[model samples]
Target: PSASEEQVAQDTEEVFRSYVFYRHQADPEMVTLPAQPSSTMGQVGRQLAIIGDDINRRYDSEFQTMLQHLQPTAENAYEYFTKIATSLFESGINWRRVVALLGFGYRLALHVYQHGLTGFLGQVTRFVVDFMLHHCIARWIAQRGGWVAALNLGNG
Candidate 1:
């Protein structure tokens, strides 16, 4: 939606902040989601690898459960999910993660923008890079933008 680098960076920043704050806050009560691989035999092995297909319902089911506890609000789900991966790009996210994501083709590959980090992981991209710094900057998103980042959506 944004054309300017500064704008994309800024929007990306807040989207990231909201994800980590929510995930960290929820971590205490968050149940460990058993890794549900796409194929029955663990052939498609990617961390949080929810495949996109007919049998993909397992992936859908797992993610829905994840969002139930994590999304600050429903409308914000896109941002929450979008920015989460972006947040984790700090990596061990590693070359493997990158390759896997790249292999995922456009859907996954489309997530990355500049400085080469994926936005699909939400607040985690920041986590991979500057956990402490971004930790302090948790944001307020749109509906789920929360109170802190409420004004964050704009340059007011």
Candidate 2:
């Protein structure tokens, strides 16, 4: 059986250390800390950031990495992951929580060595898309009405 919350939490330090070991796997990668967020706090820092297509490419790359179980050379891997993500969309799992937890890392999922990669990648992409639709582009559209409301996204 899998370890319980009480059992794991009873030894938090060791557990954290354990995952660190798993991430390293004593030398192998994939057991990793999450990528750090952009350093937008500094004005000069923000100026040095890449944007537009560069950011787009980066996002696409991140999404691809999430599908660890995918075997691209085979025919079904593409279909399998697509269907699984679709099923997840319909599963009523409250993606807001999924998004939150994916970002939360060591909370609900300590399985970063395996399937958690897929889950985390989706949420990371979700947040990027969400931020664009609800924040930047929306504000851009709101401040200066859309090209006929197609872009009339958000102002808040």
Candidate 3:
């Protein structure tokens, strides 16, 4: 028999709570802080700032390192595609835009790293083609409007 709505809700809550607890444990230094008497807005703002800084400083660097590891090789290309695809699936994002942006960023990074006109041209061409063929086509078929719409939906 299918689970009742209440049962599903309960399960989802339990999973979310477990994830929060696990994250807290994983980043004890960051998460372990004494309670402060702040207004709701203040608390929310603080959390947002912390999250933004962490993403930019830590996660961005890690992603860059991963890209560096997989540069200018078929293996790297495969890993890059797989990572973005998996991320899009898990995030439930507009796969087209996400993949397009991923390709663009990858090419930009390659250009910066290689510092060769030929390599840069090749990277840019590949990025454009992939974005047009894979991302644009996917968006068209999905009837998602385009990257801007997808971005707004994601933000919303």
Candidate 4:
């Protein structure tokens, strides 16, 4: 993975784990990356978490059904991730959709972890990183100065 993606993954994982065990929604302000003093991802990651939280909340049953029935294999994981990413990209490649993709991946990862699905976490991580760096959205991401510019959607 590229350096940028590494930070994205780590920041997202922090947000993911912060609420993975909670019975209620996570407070975005409470999410933090303690190891880093300040991080570009930390800023945007909170937003992604909030977006993801909303997605899960509003579509709780739909997402639950999607994950509960998925066959946990690397190939299956790739196809599933691709399908979701493709749908969102075709819908529009805005920052919100991009972050929502990661949010969805984090949701899937949380489900896999909760159910003790072996090796699915790594698959989810790789899929998200690869999808973000794909040619389809590379230019858009670059135009926004990579993911950092996502912190301000209006300006970008």
TM-score, every prediction: 0.21, 0.23, 0.35, 0.62
lDDT of 3 by residue, 1-156 (tens): 122322322222222222222223322322433233143322332433333333334444555565566554532454465455455446444433333333334334343434332333234334433443443333342354322232232221
Highest lDDT, which number?
4
Clashing residue pairs in all predictions, respectively, total: 20, 2, 0, 0
The segments of candidate 2 whose C-alpha lies over 4 angstroms from its true place after superposition are 1-27, 37-75, 91-93, 96-156
lDDT of 2 by residue, 40-89 (tens): 11211112112212223443334345543443322333344344444433
Q: Which candidate has the top score in TM-score?
A: 4
Output the TM-score of candidate 4: 0.62
Q: Where in model 3 is the C-alpha error above 4 Å?
A: 1-59, 71-91, 95-100, 107-117, 135-137, 140-142, 148-156
Residue 137 in candidate 4 has what lDDT? 60
2 or 3, which is superior by lDDT? 3
Ordered from best to worst TM-score, the candidate numbers read: 4, 3, 2, 1
Residue 19 displacement (Å), model 2:
12
Instruction: State how far residue 41 of model 4 sits from its true place (Å).
Output: 2.1
**Model 4 C-alpha lDDT per residue in residues 19-114, reported as the tens digit of each score:** 322322432322333333245554555555555555445444555677778844544666776886788688667765665666667667665555
What does the lDDT read for residue 64 in candidate 4?
60
TM-score, predicted candidate 2 vs. hidden true structure: 0.23
Q: Which ten residues in a row have the lowest lDDT in candidate 2?
A: 43-52
How many Å off is the CA of 69 in candidate 3? 2.6
